[PDB]
Amino acid sequence: MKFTVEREHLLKPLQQVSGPLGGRPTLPILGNLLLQVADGTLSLTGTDLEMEMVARVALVQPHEPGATTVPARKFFDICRGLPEGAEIAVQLEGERMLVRSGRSRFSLSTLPAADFPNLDDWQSEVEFTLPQATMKRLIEATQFSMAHQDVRYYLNGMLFETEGEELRTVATDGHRLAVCSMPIGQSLPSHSVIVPRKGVIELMRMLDGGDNPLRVQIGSNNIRAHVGDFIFTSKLVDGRFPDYRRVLPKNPDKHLEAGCDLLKQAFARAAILSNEKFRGVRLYVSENQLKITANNPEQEEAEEILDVTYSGAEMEIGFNVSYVLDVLNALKCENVRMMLTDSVSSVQIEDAASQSAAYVVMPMRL
């Protein structure tokens, strides 16, 4: 195996395929990247046994076929550390892989390509293409609502669903839920899968924010995404995930509309004097007015009064202010609509100008 490639043609791919690797690999091979030269292409692959990221790099300089695995962090750091424009010559020499550039030389230890973990073959059952920007929107709109190491391991991931002509994501941790739907232009078979936490992170990382379209393939137990010369594949999480349609408040009769930023800034200031652990704030809704109050164990108190559009009966309701701020931060809009029922029921929050995303937050008893 032999290849010579310009530093920058190699750097981003190395960075990307290293994504799924941890700071401390359980076993040596998991800290390595698989390098394969075949048919004028160098392929780089990184894995954590649950998912893998592959990059294809075109070789325009002389090369020889073959494969090996070498330490990912070390190889990336070497390439990144070389001068801009450096030519990086690489050759497999049995127990070691020799990297040369200028008068810089590096000998890395190798592990057999035959020993590199490989995800089982699988078949795609649904396929579609969508703009990278749509995938980014879908994930960013709901990722914060995923559980963090919950017993219901399925809540630690994100649900991806195809319906009619839309792709939708759903995340929930039992206290709040986020759902976002986006049209795809294609007619798809109704489908529902759970993508693991690290999988969601990798999907986001592979979006360059360019014109390259995103091609998705979903099987019974895997999801694959292709962008440019990168291919990400992850196993899916098994389990039964909640039906957002049922979690949404049944009859949120009371509707309030308010500027997103004024509401966010008021909650942010009130949060300063809320209980450091429980973070509770009180909302008192009255005709065209919202009063937010917060108090803590030190007898400190914050009060914010805001003009809003509201005509229902008066009511008071408590919330974890961090859950509310998380939603307002995810909604990048001018105005928001809060739909309430009563003090003991969940509230649904959405962009006042779009039903694309919806957030359900359960209240707390102050």
Partner: peptide, 7 residues
Amino acid sequence: RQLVLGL
């Protein structure tokens, strides 16, 4: 004092 959703 946090209540939970009916998932």
